UniProtKB/Swiss-Prot annotation:
The lineage of its organism: Eukaryota, Sar, Alveolata, Apicomplexa, Aconoidasida. Belongs to the eukaryotic ribosomal protein eS12 family. Signal peptide: none annotated. Component of the small ribosomal subunit. Mature ribosomes consist of a small (40S) and a large (60S) subunit. The 40S subunit contains about 32 different proteins and 1 molecule of RNA (18S). The 60S subunit contains about 42 different proteins and 3 molecules of RNA (28S, 5.8S and 5S). One of its GO terms (biological process) is maintenance of translational fidelity. One of its GO terms (cellular component) is cytosolic small ribosomal subunit. It comes from Plasmodium falciparum (isolate 3D7). Component of the ribosome, a large ribonucleoprotein complex responsible for the synthesis of proteins in the cell. The small ribosomal subunit (SSU) binds messenger RNAs (mRNAs) and translates the encoded message by selecting cognate aminoacyl-transfer RNA (tRNA) molecules. The large subunit (LSU) contains the ribosomal catalytic site termed the peptidyl transferase center (PTC), which catalyzes the formation of peptide bonds, thereby polymerizing the amino acids delivered by tRNAs into a polypeptide chain. It comes from the Eukaryota. The keyword Magnesium does not apply. Keywords: Cytoplasm, Ribonucleoprotein, Ribosomal protein. This is Small ribosomal subunit protein eS12. It is found in: Cytoplasm. GO terms for molecular function: structural constituent of ribosome.
Length: 98
């Protein structure tokens, strides 16, 4: 769980985070979103279904936590989509391997 925060920070630093539903969807529909952090605790789980199917063609808990991790200082995030990353080594070699 602590291996995600670093990645998010790196993404923030090097400009490429599609944060919040529609943007995430757009990123997915095209070869840009290289990893998708979504959530479990939602409403309707229709969102979740949409995400999963799109991925198929990480999961994780809660929205507030995601918002905190994302650039909001804190409105509900729902889903994040990372492009570019911006660095290597340390805790990216863990999470990716896992």
């Amino acid at each position: 769980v602590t291996a995600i925060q670093k990645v998010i920070k790196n993404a923030h630093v090097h400009d490429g985070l599609k944060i919040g539903i529609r943007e995430v969807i757009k990123s997915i529909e095209s070869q840009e979103a290289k990893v998708c952090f979504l959530s479990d605790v939602c409403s309707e789980p229709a969102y979740k279904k949409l995400i999963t199917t799109l991925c198929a063609e990480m999961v994780q808990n809660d929205s507030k936590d995601l918002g905190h991790w994302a650039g909001l200082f804190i409105i509900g995030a729902s889903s994040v989509a990372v492009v570019d990353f911006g660095e290597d080594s340390a805790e990216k070699d863990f999470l990716l391997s896992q």
